[PDB]
Design a binder for this molecule. Sequence first.
Ligand code: CLA
Ligand code: CLA
Ligand code: CLA
Ligand code: CLA
Ligand code: CLA
Ligand SMILES: CC1=C(/C=C/C(C)=C\C=C\C(C)=C\C=C\C=C(C)\C=C\C=C(C)\C=C\C2=C(C)CCCC2(C)C)C(C)(C)CCC1
Ligand SMILES: CC1=C(C/C=C(\C)CCC[C@H](C)CCC[C@H](C)CCCC(C)C)C(=O)c2ccccc2C1=O
Lengths: 74, 94, 143, 165, 74, 31, 731, 74
Amino acid sequence: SIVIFHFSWKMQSDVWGTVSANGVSHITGGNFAQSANTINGWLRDFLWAQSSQVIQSYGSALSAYGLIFLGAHF
Amino acid sequence: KYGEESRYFDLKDLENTVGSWDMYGQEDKSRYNGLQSEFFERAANGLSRREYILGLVAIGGAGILAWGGKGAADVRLPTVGPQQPAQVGPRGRL
Amino acid sequence: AFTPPTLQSDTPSPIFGGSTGGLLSQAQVEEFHVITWESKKEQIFEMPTGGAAIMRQGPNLLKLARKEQCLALLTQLRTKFKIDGYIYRVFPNGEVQYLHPKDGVYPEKVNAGRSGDNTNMRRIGQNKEPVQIKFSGKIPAEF
Amino acid sequence: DVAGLTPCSESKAFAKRKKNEVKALNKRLKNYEADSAPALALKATIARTEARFDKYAKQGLLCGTDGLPHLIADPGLALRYGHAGDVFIPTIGFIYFAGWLGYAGSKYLQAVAATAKPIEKEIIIDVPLAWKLLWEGFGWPLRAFAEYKNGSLMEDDAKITVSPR
Amino acid sequence: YIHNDTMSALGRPQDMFSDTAIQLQPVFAQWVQNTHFLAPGFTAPNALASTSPSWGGDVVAVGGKVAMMPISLG
Amino acid sequence: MPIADYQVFTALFLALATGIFAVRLGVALYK
Amino acid sequence: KLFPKFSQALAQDPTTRRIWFGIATAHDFESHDGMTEERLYQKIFASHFGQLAIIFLWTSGNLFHVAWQGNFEQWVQDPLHIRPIAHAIWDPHFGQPAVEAFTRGGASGPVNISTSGVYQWWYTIGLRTNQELYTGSIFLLVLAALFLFAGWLHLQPAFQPALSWFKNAESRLNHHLAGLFGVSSLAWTGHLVHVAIPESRGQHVGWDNFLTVLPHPAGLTPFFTGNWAAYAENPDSASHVFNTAQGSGTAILTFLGGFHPQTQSLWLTDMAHHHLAIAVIFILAGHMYRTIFGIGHSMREILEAQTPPSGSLGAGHKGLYDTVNNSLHFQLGLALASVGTISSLVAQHMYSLPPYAFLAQDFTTQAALYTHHQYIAGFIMCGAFAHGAIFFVRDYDPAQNRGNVLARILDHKEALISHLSWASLFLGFHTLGLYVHNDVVQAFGTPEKQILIEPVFAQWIQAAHGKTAYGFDFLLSSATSAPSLAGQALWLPGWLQGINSDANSLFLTIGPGDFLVHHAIALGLHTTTLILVKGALDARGSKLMPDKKDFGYSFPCDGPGRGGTCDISAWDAFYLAVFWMLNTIGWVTFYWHWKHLGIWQGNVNQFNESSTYLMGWLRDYLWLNSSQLINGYNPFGMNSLSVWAWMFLFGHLIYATGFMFLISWRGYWQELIETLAWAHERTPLANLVRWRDKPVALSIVQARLVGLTHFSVGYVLTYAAFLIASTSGKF
Amino acid sequence: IWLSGMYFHGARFSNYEAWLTDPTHIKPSAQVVWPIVGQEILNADVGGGFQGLQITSGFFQLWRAAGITSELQL
Ligand code: CLA
Ligand code: CLA
Ligand code: CLA
Ligand code: CLA
Ligand code: CLA
Ligand SMILES: CC1=C(/C=C/C(C)=C\C=C\C(C)=C\C=C\C=C(C)\C=C\C=C(C)\C=C\C2=C(C)CCCC2(C)C)C(C)(C)CCC1
Ligand SMILES: CC1=C(C/C=C(\C)CCC[C@H](C)CCC[C@H](C)CCCC(C)C)C(=O)c2ccccc2C1=O
């Protein structure tokens, strides 16, 4: 779990993104280098910031992921 | 022991058979040179008693409290420095 | 009558390479047990502390930290080798106390001449209620 | 109006919710050609949504502050105001069907308990017997009331194990 | 991590372990990335490019999205 | 009007007195 | 080696389990060696004195810290725009931004903003100055010293009371109801009328001038001539301002009900009248039982006479007097049950009927007080059930409880446990099924397919109070009804104004989400009661372990035989039920906090269409309100909410450290400790030192208790941090 | 059997040919759902005139690497 959390945060912050012919716009915007040394950074900038996609997924195609997100907590 | 063959138990020599050994402790009188041994035993003379070595801890705690009295401020430290304005809050509070 | 066998101190030990599960600091200042058995051939057995040891022809002598290790070795000798043995309790001051085959025959077989203590003549449900023994320092079953 | 609630036939927020759902589905529509399979699927979804909203307005459900149907779970309060189908009628329906299943299982237990090997009959189910008892369990309420009046439904406490207090 | 949490919560960002304060740099891993990046034309004479862009070099972009770009370790 | 130094010192002395009372009660309870 | 002098059996343990169990068995005086019942009860009495002294010292410390480092003077003048200050902070670990971020309510240095509500309470009871608070602290210091001296005195054999004195039930009830309950309430009425009533109206009353100031202009003569209505002449007007003489009055015992318009709290004259009536009734109740004066009741004979014919209750209450009187655990269970229920009542009443001046505007204070009292009530109720299980294990005598209601309820305990299991199973099935169905229909884009059962019964009782919002027009909601006309010149106007206003917490408007969460609360209470009741009733024995009463209240197990006997004691049932209590109080306080968060923002809708499904609970409450909490400190800096962020992560850490003891069990750890003992016993340069006590793994019961303690501590710290941060940072 | 099912779903209930024309913008999908209880909302607007669950298993990329480019071959 820690390995895959590090993978997802590191490549959403420093690898994956869009190009605009003047730079690279990452998914989260380089927040790993200044927040992944703090547990509050993992809880907030990774585990709370990226969780907005699964909790606001009701009424869309990702509603099944939203439902499984709660069923797996159960 | 009497371990001349495969006999590792002996009631007449029960000291060695149990496993009580020195491992590395060896007996030797020679170690520290002259005058300095007397210097250090005079430095730690009367302090060897339990009550006075307790009193050393007592004066150490006195130093701990002396830091709080006058010593925390001598190294600045933010807990005794001044303050710069304030913040109001969410609503009309203070 | 039965007499306990003496612990022959100069008894050979099984061939073994040296383990980390052997004796510790409890042996020097409290107690260490010892087991003695007679083997009819040179063969490999399993140590209670881990690893394999070869017991030799004739008498074999092995000291262990606990009595439970000695009984584990004795029961594996009795099952996988059909070999009986004697266990002794050795205090560090020098006194040796005989242990498991106390009256000669094994405890699972009657001997007619033992102490039948800790044998209540009542049922499980015939013990006293805890309120009737209140403030006594005893459980209801030892009345 | 049974508890400050308005009927969904006349509540404005129910119509607003229906309009919002249909508009969202139309926004989904406005990306495909008219006769594609996704277009037919979205048209069917729209028809189902409009039918559901019109049926909910037709059946006389109560809507709260916004347009969500509310159910009444009080006999009398739902009987004289015509909402017995909210809770009372499904209560009767569940009681009947659950009693059917439970009585069928009970009668299977008492039928196989007096056999040669009751242990085997519970992992290896006698299918014709189970089918017969499932059919017979449709008259569960009358059978259960008859066995209760006969006293053969319950067991005497002197023949049931308890702990020694 | 707990020390970093405590120093951030105490208002002492200069005392936590970070790239901007007390550095803990993966020098062995960074040098291994450099060795891989400099491998073609030197210790990999027949290689026209490194095995992965993660070691170093230009950002690989496909269809406006980054395929693989170098990963920096801090 | 915040309290003075003498009030704090008197309160601390009375707390020392009730601490003596507390350790007396504790010793009586241990015995 | 002789540290647990109360238990020589524990003192002979050569391991760390000796000290571990010495700490934890120190207060089990009944299990101590050489303990008689006289010495038992005397130790109980002296420990009670110690506890009273501790409580008095704690409240004196609160008073001294508010008087010394608080802003009570500034808070009295501006109660709605000044943050109350708990105590100053002196932490040498603070950086400079931490020192700035914690300087808030006009203080010189860093301070903590109080959420305990002591400011509102002290302002309401007439305390105005820091000098008065310091005087109260000094008086409580002296009185705690006096109680310590009394505790020492009654342990002395010249002053040790007899055991029969301890068991004198009729006298103790008579004096507790008449004096401890009644006279104290009468004296509080005296304080309210003499001090709190004039201080509410801008008239200072102190020890220097309370003998020259008149509480009512017609002094004592209306009281002694029976013209008591002259003490309710002119009440405080609706335009009255607290702590000022603007639109005040002279009446000391009004009866209007409702709330003060400015403070949004109960009238103080209503409180004085209430306390006087309570004092009268409690003095009367304390004149009930027989002592030495030839009149009164023998409660044993009352219990004897409460036997219905036809054997409906068996022998009725045959010998229950001796059962209660001889058993300290029965009395402790009754006391804890009642005190926990009263704590729940206090939580449920102070939020909806705010008692203290300028309460229910301090949103953090109300939420913190409610959650505190609810958690205390849950813990105390679990303790009540645990001590009932102990009484079944220890003090229950089947011979003297033969045929009475205790033996009857033990006889058919299987029916009770099975029906609690049925009720819990039904509640869990149905509430979870409705919630999951609502989640699924919400996810699929169809909110109209939700099952929204209207709470018609609770709305009907709300209408019986006068809430004219559901259109019942039942009892007090119809003015023509007899209860409405009976008190229309009494409490009905103010109570109706309170009940029909949406600006307070006097019976909030409820909907389907309230129905679902009330069934969740019912499931929690039912299952916790199931575990606790099953543990009590199976404490003496079960089918798996018939002789469980011989093994005591707490023990690890009975070995892996008979299929396995893990967690078989009644202690283990209490242990399992503490988790369920924590879950139930979590549901209760989540419900309260989310409802009041919707109310305080003016957005009741967020709760109304988000509480019916669990994704709304996770997203619109847990995720949404934690945004300011987790930003208490960040790479961009820190603010005042940093302490609650640190406590949030702290509670998470303690919770998972509890999970460590909860999941892993004693056997892996014992082998690991043996391996480390081997390491240290033959590591060079460390063999010079050795352990005096043999290092062993924690016992099964001990580590269950440790995991439960960490679970509860992490639970409480995490929720307190989240609640205080999400309310104080927002309001 | 599992591999046969994946290839059959790639053949019948997938937008693989459409994805081959525009792999940059069309989201891969190889599973569709039956409209029964409002669950047709899980059929995403993946693209290519197709509705279905967006798959994350990477069969489309593997098949393109193998050089399929046909429904009949799957
Ligand atoms: C048909 C068999 C059957 C019957 C008649 C009952 C009847 C009863 N059960 Mg029980 N139960 C069963 C099976 C059954 N149960 C099974 C298989 C389990 C294991 C999951 C349980 C576990 C269980 C618990 C834990 C409890 C009960 C309780 C109860 C009582 C309360 C009412 C209730 O419905 O509770 C609820 C019943 C369930 C949740 C289980 C239902 C499972 C299915 C639907 C039943 C099995 C169907 C069966 C295979 C059909 C066979 C058909 C036949 C033709 C072959 C009640 C008398 C409660 C009690 O003691 O009340 C005092 C209680 O606490 N049951
Ligand atoms: C009129 C005489 C009298 C009085 C005043 C007392 C008073 C007291 N006795 Mg005593 N006792 C008496 C006679 C009396 N007793 C007699 C005659 C006997 C012999 C038969 C005993 C035998 C006895 C024993 C054996 C013990 C006591 C104990 C106590 C103390 C109870 C603990 C406590 O303080 O909680 C206070 C209780 C209340 C304040 C009642 C409040 C009611 C509920 C719980 C709270 C609700 C009130 C309100 C809403 C709270 C708002 C306050 C908030 C704003 C802060 C208490 C001070 C116990 C003790 O502590 O030992 C010292 C104890 O062990 N008594
Ligand atoms: C125990 C609480 C208490 C105490 C200590 C006092 C004390 C006092 N009151 Mg007060 N008062 C109280 C409650 C209390 N009151 C209540 C509940 C009310 C009704 C709301 C009033 C209403 C009131 C008025 C209107 C006035 C006072 C006044 C006074 C002062 C003059 C004494 C007096 O009244 O003449 C002497 C009283 C008597 C001779 C009769 C007392 C005999 C009674 C009926 C029986 C005693 C039993 C009783 C339970 C004993 C309690 C003991 C307790 C003190 C420990 C005095 C310091 C007067 C004053 O001038 O203010 C400064 C005044 O005008 N009081
Ligand atoms: C008026 C209240 C009251 C009283 C007088 C008693 C009295 C007694 N209880 Mg009891 N109990 C109570 C309430 C009370 N209890 C409540 C509310 C609960 C629910 C939590 C319990 C649950 C309970 C159990 C399960 C048991 C007892 C037992 C006992 C008896 C021995 C006490 C003991 O074990 O030694 C001393 C007790 C302790 C030293 C407590 C241990 C310390 C706790 C667990 C850790 C606290 C850590 C702290 C919160 C950390 C701070 C957090 C911060 C750092 C972040 C004793 C007669 C035991 C017994 O009867 O023996 C058979 C027994 O097993 N109690
Ligand atoms: C977040 C909860 C939590 C925590 C803190 C731990 C912590 C630990 N586990 Mg553990 N575990 C957990 C959950 C947790 N576990 C759960 C839920 C399970 C069930 C599956 C297990 C099962 C498990 C097993 C099977 C084992 C461990 C082991 C260990 C220890 C490894 C040694 C180490 O990490 O070095 C350092 C210690 C820490 C990182 C803990 C925090 C210490 C802080 C960061 C520094 C200390 C400063 C201190 C607070 C200052 C003192 C202040 C003073 C006032 C007290 C360690 C103490 C292993 C072990 O025994 O040791 C090898 C072991 O084999 N755990
Ligand atoms: C374990 C145990 C125990 C304990 C138990 C418990 C814990 C119990 C409880 C319980 C509880 C916790 C209860 C509660 C209660 C209460 C009640 C039961 C009440 C009542 C009444 C009524 C009826 C009311 C009415 C009314 C209303 C509704 C409101 C308004 C007013 C009026 C009056 C109208 C003991 C030790 C004993 C014994 C042993 C065992
Ligand atoms: C870690 C662990 C151990 C090992 C035991 C350990 C590590 C105890 C050692 C703890 C040391 C002493 C530090 C504890 C710090 C405490 C905060 C100090 C509290 C002391 C009180 C007197 C206050 C077990 O024995 C065990 C047994 C059964 C189930 C689970 C477990 C288990 O999880």
